[PDB]
Design an enzyme around this catalytic site. Sequence first.
Site, PDB file in Angstrom:
ATOM      1  N   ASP A   8     -22.050  41.385  33.562  1.00 15.57           N
ATOM      2  CA  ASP A   8     -21.247  42.820  33.998  1.00 15.57           C
ATOM      3  C   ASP A   8     -21.730  43.952  33.091  1.00 15.57           C
ATOM      4  OD1 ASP A   8     -19.371  44.184  35.717  1.00 15.57           O
ATOM      5  OD2 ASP A   8     -17.793  43.614  34.485  1.00 15.57           O
ATOM      6  N   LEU A   9     -21.363  44.944  33.614  1.00 19.02           N
ATOM      7  CA  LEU A   9     -21.462  46.323  32.861  1.00 19.02           C
ATOM      8  C   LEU A   9     -20.091  46.662  32.171  1.00 19.02           C
ATOM      9  CD1 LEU A   9     -23.470  48.668  32.450  1.00 19.02           C
ATOM     10  CD2 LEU A   9     -22.720  49.585  34.536  1.00 19.02           C
ATOM     11  N   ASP A  10     -19.209  47.087  32.780  1.00 17.32           N
ATOM     12  CA  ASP A  10     -18.106  47.778  32.569  1.00 17.32           C
ATOM     13  C   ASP A  10     -17.443  46.635  31.590  1.00 17.32           C
ATOM     14  OD1 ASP A  10     -16.473  50.319  32.695  1.00 17.32           O
ATOM     15  OD2 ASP A  10     -15.202  48.684  33.047  1.00 17.32           O
ATOM     16  N   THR A  16     -16.571  53.186  31.052  1.00 18.54           N
ATOM     17  CA  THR A  16     -16.691  54.727  31.287  1.00 18.54           C
ATOM     18  C   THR A  16     -15.068  54.925  31.635  1.00 18.54           C
ATOM     19  OG1 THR A  16     -17.621  53.865  33.606  1.00 18.54           O
ATOM     20  CG2 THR A  16     -19.211  55.115  31.812  1.00 18.54           C
ATOM     21  N   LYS A  45      -7.250  51.691  36.526  1.00 16.49           N
ATOM     22  CA  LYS A  45      -8.134  50.533  35.960  1.00 16.49           C
ATOM     23  C   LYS A  45      -8.495  49.311  36.760  1.00 16.49           C
ATOM     24  CE  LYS A  45      -8.311  52.182  31.312  1.00 16.49           C
ATOM     25  NZ  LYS A  45      -7.761  52.293  30.194  1.00 16.49           N
ATOM     26  N   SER A 114     -23.522  44.013  38.401  1.00 19.05           N
ATOM     27  CA  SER A 114     -22.467  45.012  38.157  1.00 19.05           C
ATOM     28  C   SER A 114     -22.364  45.445  39.551  1.00 19.05           C
ATOM     29  CB  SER A 114     -22.798  45.985  37.194  1.00 19.05           C
ATOM     30  OG  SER A 114     -21.665  46.983  37.373  1.00 19.05           O
ATOM     31  N   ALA A 115     -21.116  45.953  39.871  1.00 18.64           N
ATOM     32  CA  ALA A 115     -20.738  46.711  41.127  1.00 18.64           C
ATOM     33  C   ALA A 115     -21.055  48.114  40.813  1.00 18.64           C
ATOM     34  CB  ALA A 115     -19.388  46.613  41.609  1.00 18.64           C
ATOM     35  N   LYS A 145     -16.832  41.067  43.877  1.00 15.55           N
ATOM     36  CA  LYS A 145     -15.869  40.158  43.025  1.00 15.55           C
ATOM     37  C   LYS A 145     -14.400  40.170  43.735  1.00 15.55           C
ATOM     38  CE  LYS A 145     -18.990  41.662  39.460  1.00 15.55           C
ATOM     39  NZ  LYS A 145     -19.247  42.339  37.886  1.00 15.55           N
ATOM     40  N   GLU A 169     -18.094  38.288  31.326  1.00 16.24           N
ATOM     41  CA  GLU A 169     -17.180  39.293  32.205  1.00 16.24           C
ATOM     42  C   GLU A 169     -15.719  39.247  31.572  1.00 16.24           C
ATOM     43  OE1 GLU A 169     -16.182  40.944  34.328  1.00 16.24           O
ATOM     44  OE2 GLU A 169     -17.382  40.877  36.388  1.00 16.24           O
ATOM     45  N   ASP A 170     -15.244  40.594  31.734  1.00 13.00           N
ATOM     46  CA  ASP A 170     -13.785  40.929  31.229  1.00 13.00           C
ATOM     47  C   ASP A 170     -12.700  40.951  32.078  1.00 13.00           C
ATOM     48  OD1 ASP A 170     -14.850  43.297  32.560  1.00 13.00           O
ATOM     49  OD2 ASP A 170     -13.487  44.573  31.435  1.00 13.00           O
TER      50      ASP A 170
HETATM   51 MG    MG Z   1     -16.210  44.046  33.852  1.00  9.50          MG
END
Ligand code: MG
Length: 218
Positions: A8-10, A16, A45, A114-115, A145, A169-170
Site C-alpha cells: 500500500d502507499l498511504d 499525504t 481519514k 494502492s487506490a 479494499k 498495510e496500515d
Molecule cells: Mg494504507
Amino acid sequence: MFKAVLFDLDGVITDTAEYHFRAWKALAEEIGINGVDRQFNEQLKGVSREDSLQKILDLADKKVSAEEFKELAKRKNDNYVKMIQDVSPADVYPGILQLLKDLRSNKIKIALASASKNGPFLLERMNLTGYFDAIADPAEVAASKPAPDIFIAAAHAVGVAPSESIGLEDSQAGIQAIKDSGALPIGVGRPEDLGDDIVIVPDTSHYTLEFLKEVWLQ
Ligand SMILES: [Mg+2]
C-alpha cells in the site's frame, strides 16, 4: 521464501494527510463552513472523497445539487494535487527505502497495490519508481479494499500468485483485502484497528527483509 511484496502507499510508504487536511480546510473556508480543524479532520481519514464532502456539508446542514457537489469535490482535489507537488524523498517513511533495496537485491518482486490515483506521480516525487516492478492501476479494478482485487492485480502484474506474496498495510480494510487475496499480511499500527490474528509492527522501521523472512518462515 516469498517471491513478492505488495505495498500500500498511504500509511506504509508515505502519507499525504497534512495536504488532504489543508485541502478540505481551504475548501471549508472558501464555502464558509466552520469546524474543519485538525481534530474534526480525523473523521475524514480513510473516508472517500464524496463521504468526506458530505460530512463537511453536514456541519452546516447545507444542501447542494449534484453539479455543485461535483464541483466542490473537484476543487478539493485540485487543491490537493497542487499541494502534493512538494512531495520529496524526505517523505519516505523510515525503513522503506532500505527495505526496497534489500528486496530488489534479493530479486524479490515489488508492486504497488494502492487506490491512490496519484500513485505513479508520488513514487516519482520520492524517487522510488526504479524499485517497482509494477503498479496496479486502481482504475482497472472492479472493487476497492476490503475487496482483494487490487492485491490480486498487483501480484499477477509481477508474475506471481498472491499466495507467493506478502502484503503490507496500515488499515483494517487493507489487511482484509490481503487476507482474501491469499497473500500473507503484515500490518503496521495497532491490534485495536488492524486485528490480532495477524502480525503487526509498531512502525515501518520494523519492516526489514530479515523480519519479513522470519514471518514467512512462521
Ligand atoms: Mg494504507
